[PDB]
Amino acid sequence: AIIPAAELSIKTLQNIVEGITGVDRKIAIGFKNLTDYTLENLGVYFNSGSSDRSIAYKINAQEALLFSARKSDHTARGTVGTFSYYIQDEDKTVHVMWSVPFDYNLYSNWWNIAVVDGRQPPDSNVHDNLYNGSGGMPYPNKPDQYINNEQKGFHLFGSMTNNGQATIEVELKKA
């Protein structure tokens, strides 16, 4: 679940997500910690679906997390959630939201990354605020776009693909 950040490739994420057979909505997320800080997982909140592997509790300096999630069998929902990492020594939390919906006639893929003050575990309120751009969260990000922004002394970069076997590649650096 943890590799050196410099070894992360889009091909690795493609392999991960394509290896989830049996459902039509799933995601692989590769998240690079390009800081010198240790990141501590505060949880994963699932709005829709689940995951078959535990998220890494610690992402150390210059490592990437590999994470995957998938929709549930027999349901008209997709894979949607938020994971969160506390930046040890900075008293801030980084949230990563993903949404790969069941119904592309109505909805599209979305993602978000936010840096907030304090130690903030993910939950339905945090997730909804990231999805809607409310409660002090930035507005979320469309797929097929390279996102670059700065928040609370950090630079955030990443992108998401557009379909039901989605990938997100995202990176945290000190600004």
Residue numbers in the entry: 4 to 178
Give the published text:
To address how these known relations to cnidarian actinoporins are reflected in the 3D structure of bryoporin, we determined its crystal structure. Recombinant bryoporin crystallized in the space group P22121 with one molecule in the asymmetric unit. The electron density map was of high quality and fit all residues of the bryoporin polypeptide chain, except for the first three N-terminal residues. In addition, 13 residues of the C-terminal linker, containing the affinity His6-tag introduced during the cloning, could not be traced in the electron density, likely due to flexibility. The overall structure of the monomeric bryoporin reveals a conserved actinoporin fold, thereby reflecting bryoporin’s high amino acid sequence similarity to actinoporins. Bryoporin is built of a compact β-sandwich composed of two parallel β-sheets of five and four β-strands, flanked by two α-helices. An additional notable difference between bryoporin and a typical actinoporin, such as FraC, is in the electrostatic surface potential, which is overall more negative in the case of bryoporin.
Our results suggest that bryoporin could represent a part of the moss defense arsenal, acting as a pore-forming toxin against membranes of potential animal pathogens, parasites, or predators.
